Design a protein around this motif. Structure first.
Motif, PDB file in Angstrom:
ATOM      1  N   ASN A  15       0.849  -1.180   0.000  1.00 49.38           N
ATOM      2  CA  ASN A  15       0.000   0.000   0.000  1.00 49.38           C
ATOM      3  C   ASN A  15       0.885   1.230   0.000  1.00 49.38           C
ATOM      4  OD1 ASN A  15      -2.932   1.096   0.610  1.00 49.38           O
ATOM      5  ND2 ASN A  15      -1.506   2.266   1.897  1.00 49.38           N
ATOM      6  N   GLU A  16       1.958   1.161   0.782  1.00 49.71           N
ATOM      7  CA  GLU A  16       2.911   2.253   0.918  1.00 49.71           C
ATOM      8  C   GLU A  16       3.643   2.519  -0.389  1.00 49.71           C
ATOM      9  OE1 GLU A  16       2.465   3.806   3.325  1.00 49.71           O
ATOM     10  OE2 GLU A  16       4.070   5.317   3.297  1.00 49.71           O
ATOM     11  N   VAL A  17       4.027   1.459  -1.085  1.00 48.15           N
ATOM     12  CA  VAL A  17       4.707   1.617  -2.361  1.00 48.15           C
ATOM     13  C   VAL A  17       3.760   2.254  -3.388  1.00 48.15           C
ATOM     14  CG1 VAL A  17       5.935   0.412  -4.163  1.00 48.15           C
ATOM     15  CG2 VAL A  17       6.054  -0.360  -1.805  1.00 48.15           C
ATOM     16  N   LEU A  18       2.474   1.928  -3.297  1.00 44.82           N
ATOM     17  CA  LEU A  18       1.471   2.481  -4.202  1.00 44.82           C
ATOM     18  C   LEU A  18       1.183   3.934  -3.864  1.00 44.82           C
ATOM     19  CD1 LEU A  18      -1.214  -0.311  -4.539  1.00 44.82           C
ATOM     20  CD2 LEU A  18       0.188   0.707  -6.385  1.00 44.82           C
ATOM     21  N   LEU A  19       0.982   4.193  -2.579  1.00 44.67           N
ATOM     22  CA  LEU A  19       0.700   5.534  -2.104  1.00 44.67           C
ATOM     23  C   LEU A  19       1.836   6.468  -2.504  1.00 44.67           C
ATOM     24  CD1 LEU A  19      -0.588   6.398   1.485  1.00 44.67           C
ATOM     25  CD2 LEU A  19       1.302   7.678   0.415  1.00 44.67           C
ATOM     26  N   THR A 112      -7.695   1.782  -3.991  1.00 42.57           N
ATOM     27  CA  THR A 112      -8.599   2.666  -3.279  1.00 42.57           C
ATOM     28  C   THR A 112      -7.970   3.249  -2.022  1.00 42.57           C
ATOM     29  OG1 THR A 112     -10.608   1.606  -4.117  1.00 42.57           O
ATOM     30  CG2 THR A 112     -10.790   2.808  -2.030  1.00 42.57           C
ATOM     31  N   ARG A 113      -7.321   2.409  -1.231  1.00 43.79           N
ATOM     32  CA  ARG A 113      -6.693   2.878  -0.004  1.00 43.79           C
ATOM     33  C   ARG A 113      -5.467   3.733  -0.308  1.00 43.79           C
ATOM     34  NH1 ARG A 113      -2.823  -0.567   4.038  1.00 43.79           N
ATOM     35  NH2 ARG A 113      -2.868   0.795   5.888  1.00 43.79           N
ATOM     36  N   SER A 114      -4.627   3.272  -1.225  1.00 42.41           N
ATOM     37  CA  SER A 114      -3.418   4.016  -1.563  1.00 42.41           C
ATOM     38  C   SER A 114      -3.652   5.365  -2.251  1.00 42.41           C
ATOM     39  CB  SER A 114      -2.486   3.156  -2.426  1.00 42.41           C
ATOM     40  OG  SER A 114      -3.042   2.914  -3.698  1.00 42.41           O
ATOM     41  N   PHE A 115      -4.664   5.456  -3.113  1.00 45.87           N
ATOM     42  CA  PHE A 115      -4.951   6.704  -3.818  1.00 45.87           C
ATOM     43  C   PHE A 115      -5.561   7.671  -2.824  1.00 45.87           C
ATOM     44  CE2 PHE A 115      -7.298   9.592  -6.644  1.00 45.87           C
ATOM     45  CZ  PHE A 115      -6.273   9.903  -7.540  1.00 45.87           C
ATOM     46  N   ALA A 163     -15.769   2.900  -5.785  1.00 45.24           N
ATOM     47  CA  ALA A 163     -15.434   4.079  -4.996  1.00 45.24           C
ATOM     48  C   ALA A 163     -13.913   4.241  -4.871  1.00 45.24           C
ATOM     49  CB  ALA A 163     -16.063   3.963  -3.620  1.00 45.24           C
ATOM     50  N   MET A 164     -13.201   3.770  -5.888  1.00 44.31           N
ATOM     51  CA  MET A 164     -11.739   3.804  -5.928  1.00 44.31           C
ATOM     52  C   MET A 164     -11.055   5.173  -5.902  1.00 44.31           C
ATOM     53  SD  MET A 164      -9.378   1.921  -8.710  1.00 44.31           S
ATOM     54  CE  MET A 164      -9.912   0.293  -8.191  1.00 44.31           C
ATOM     55  N   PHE A 165     -11.360   6.038  -6.872  1.00 49.28           N
ATOM     56  CA  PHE A 165     -10.730   7.364  -6.930  1.00 49.28           C
ATOM     57  C   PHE A 165     -11.619   8.495  -6.413  1.00 49.28           C
ATOM     58  CE2 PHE A 165      -7.254   5.629  -9.319  1.00 49.28           C
ATOM     59  CZ  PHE A 165      -7.817   4.677 -10.165  1.00 49.28           C
ATOM     60  N   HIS A 166     -12.686   8.142  -5.704  1.00 53.15           N
ATOM     61  CA  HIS A 166     -13.635   9.113  -5.169  1.00 53.15           C
ATOM     62  C   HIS A 166     -13.056  10.016  -4.083  1.00 53.15           C
ATOM     63  CE1 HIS A 166     -17.083  10.762  -3.025  1.00 53.15           C
ATOM     64  NE2 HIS A 166     -17.853  10.431  -4.045  1.00 53.15           N
ATOM     65  N   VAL A 167     -13.466  11.281  -4.098  1.00 51.60           N
ATOM     66  CA  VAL A 167     -13.031  12.256  -3.103  1.00 51.60           C
ATOM     67  C   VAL A 167     -14.275  12.664  -2.328  1.00 51.60           C
ATOM     68  CG1 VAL A 167     -12.126  14.547  -2.673  1.00 51.60           C
ATOM     69  CG2 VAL A 167     -11.201  13.188  -4.550  1.00 51.60           C
TER      70      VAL A 167
END
Length: 296
Positions: A15-19, A112-115, A163-167
């Motif tokens: 997740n950290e590498v993605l974030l 979703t979590r990383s973005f 709800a992946m890239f949702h703000v």
């Protein structure tokens, strides 16, 4: 369970590498293109975008695409991730529906979590101007609309049947309000009431211009967010003025002329879609107090 805690750490790391990857594309796009909508006039570019990111065409002739380069880049990266996972799941010898299930869940949780973690980190940045923030908000809406093609990709790759890239329309408002309010606070630093015509303080007047000019720039794009930022805007102005009174006749009639300017503004429909004295009631308490001050 050491083996369980080990799996957990691997996920937190992934997740950290993605974030931190999401954050890297954001710094780059801010530096190289200052987060502006992608503009081009040359088929060998228009389609170069249309191929990297599925967007319903147009034919006509800055300001070209509704979104910045972050959109195709991020979409592309999500795609490479899904690919990686299916490839990997296939190596673990899972059946096609098991790969489609695996991927669809594990990937849509990590992305979703990383973005989301990225957005959180990018909004904390001062480098992000209010205009760029609005850009990011609509940008994520276009990615949101591309969510389906992503799912199809998994279906096609695995040759599977559907709800992946949702703000948070709530964290968007807070972020917008804070910037509009801090900018408001700067204008109030030009107030010199304890010092020395029957006109309003130049800072109130310029603030109002900046506010009118700021609301117009994104209200037609993000109506509800605009309506929200506007409510917060007037609430904050109401409190800065109250804070002023809380601290020589000529000065008392300077605060009056300044509050009137704000009262007119509230009654002018700065943003379509609150229409009746909603903004105005933010100044009632102040007007009452002021008037009770003048009677002395």
């Amino acid at each position: 369970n050491i083996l369980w805690e080990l799996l957990h750490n691997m996920r937190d790391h992934y997740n950290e590498v993605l974030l931190q990857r999401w954050v890297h594309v954001f710094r780059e796009i801010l530096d190289k293109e200052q987060f502006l909508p992608m503009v081009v006039q040359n088929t060998e570019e228009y389609e170069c975008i249309i191929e990297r990111f599925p967007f319903h065409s147009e034919q006509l002739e800055p300001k070209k695409f509704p979104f910045s380069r972050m959109v195709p880049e991020v979409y592309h990266q999500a795609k490479e991730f899904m690919y990686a996972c299916m490839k990997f799941a296939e190596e673990l010898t899972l059946s096609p529906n098991e790969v489609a299930a695996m991927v669809r869940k594990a990937a849509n949780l990590l992305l979703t979590r990383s973005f989301s973690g990225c957005l959180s980190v990018v909004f904390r940045q001062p480098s992000i101007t209010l205009t760029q923030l609005i850009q990011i908000i609509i940008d994520t809406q276009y990615l949101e609309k591309a969510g389906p093609f992503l799912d199809e990709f998994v279906c096609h790759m695995t040759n599977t049947e559907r709800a992946m890239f949702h703000v948070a329309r709530q964290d968007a408002e807070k972020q917008v309000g804070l910037r509009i309010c801090s900018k408001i606070d700067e204008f109030f630093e030009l107030s010199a009431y304890d010092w020395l015509p029957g006109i309003a303080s130049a800072f109130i007047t310029d603030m109002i211009s900046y506010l009118k000019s700021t609301f117009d720039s994104f209200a037609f794009k993000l109506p509800h967010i605009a309506q929200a930022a506007c409510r917060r805007t007037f609430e904050h102005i109401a409190e800065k003025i109250y804070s002023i009174m809380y601290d020589s006749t000529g000065a008392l009639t300077q605060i009056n002329l300044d509050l009137m300017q704000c009262e007119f503004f509230a009654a002018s429909e700065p943003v379509p879609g609150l229409k009746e004295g909603e903004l105005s009631k933010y100044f009632l308490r102040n007007r009452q107090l002021l008037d009770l001050l003048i009677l002395e």
